[PDB]
Each structure stands twice: as structure tokens, then as C-alpha cells.
Amino acid sequence: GSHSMRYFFTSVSRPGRGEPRFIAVGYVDDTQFVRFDSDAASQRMEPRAPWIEQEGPEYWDGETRKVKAHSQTHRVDLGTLRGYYNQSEAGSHTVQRMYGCDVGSDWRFLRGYHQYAYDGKDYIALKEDLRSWTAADMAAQTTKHKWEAAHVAEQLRAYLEGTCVEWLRRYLENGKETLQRTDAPKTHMTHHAVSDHEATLRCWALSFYPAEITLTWQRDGEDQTQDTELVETRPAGDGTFQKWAAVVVPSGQEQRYTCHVQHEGLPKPLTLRW
């Protein structure tokens, strides 16, 4: 299947005193592998998966240097944005940045992205062609012009098409035991009686990786969405994911209903029936 490397950065200004809270996380697919937290004692990029620990002191110095440079960029940005939007020095505000690359099943570059937000709203994003910008408002337009003059897109494209994919490939090989393994969902159905006339069937998908999954209900072989509930896919905390889908059915008619599970780890989709 396809793979991705993504970094997420959050900076939150602290107006009363000091520098912004800064948190950076790196993922390969749905596996976090590094972190930086300005509140933590080390002031280093830290490992969060075993397969990254083999990288040497020069890697950790380099990543620490770059992630600190990100934090300082965001510090400046927070001041600039406050000015652009005519905001006081009293309120806390948020900068968010996410970038990364996707590769296909052949491990070749598929797409790149670099998105930036101020206070939880779109500010500026690199377009799909990696050669132009989407600026949401006139403040971000000013930024767009600045970044065009500085040829930011070309240098980001070189990272996203080259460096990002090269290191993604490296991580996928070094972490092969977990990163290239699929864990198929462990499935079962539960039954819950509301009344004499109504029952809830819940179809469970547990302990799966990667997080992408589809759960659907059918009645007499036809998709049913009415009287169904589908929860957000959620982390188990051991690196796997969980999801369930439920349907309300007339008591005694449980056998009409089937749950269908689609996942990368399943060569053919599963069907469950009460």
C-alpha cells in the first residue's frame, strides 16, 4: 500500500511571559517516531519508536537544530500575525504547520504538501503542483508575495519530492518489522436489547494497523445507513486502532443484518452476522 511521512507543529503564544509552547511530532503512516516539546527537559528531538534509535548523534543534533529553528520561525510569525490581524498583546494565539510526502505502493513520490494555519483557520498552503500557493485572506496574500519573491516553493518542492521520500524509504526499511506489517482487524459482534421490540447490533474492529478501515452494515444484502452509528477511529495505545459500527434492528430480525469489514490486512473483506 501507500506510505507517508508527516510532521505536525503547534506553537501557542504565552502573552504574560516567555516563549510560545512548541510541540512537534513526526509520523511514518500512523506511527509516531519523534517528538519535541519545549516544556520537556531534554530540549532535543526525542525518539518515540525503536527503529529510529539506531540513528546516530549527528541525526539527533541535526533534527534538534532544525526543529528549534521551526520554533523560532513560529515565535516570529506569532508577532507578525498579531500585527497583520490588529490583535492585542493580551490574547494567546496558535500557529499550526503540517508538511510531508506520500509515496505509492512502489515507494515512489505520489504527492507533497505544506499547510499553515493561524488560530485554527487556513492561512497559506502549497498547491498540489508544489509551484504555487493558496492564500486564504489578504494577510496570507502578503505572505504569498514574500514567499514567491524568496522562491520558497522551489526549495520546499525539492524537499517534498526528494529528501522527504528518500528518508521515508529509509525509515520504512529500518522499521520493516512494524512499519511494513499489516495487522488485520480482530472482529466480533455484540447484541444489546433496548426493549422487547428493539435491539442494537455492534460490529467491532480491534487491534488493527494501519488506521484506515471501512465498516458498513447491510440489510438483506443492501447497504443501510439509517439507524446506524459509526464512531471515530481511535488509538488503542499500543500502536493499533479500534472502531465500531452499530445498527438498531427489530428484535428477532438480527439475521437480516450483516457487517462488512474492509482493511489492507484483509485479502477479502470480512462478513459478520448475528
Partner: peptide
């Protein structure tokens, strides 16, 4: 592997 964010690339 984090981006080499150049100093000029502030908003």
C-alpha cells in the same frame, strides 16, 4: 527527517 527551514521563510 525535518525540513531545512530557511530563516527568511517567516510569514
Amino acid at each position: 527527517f525535518v525540513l531545512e527551514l530557511e530563516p527568511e521563510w517567516t510569514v
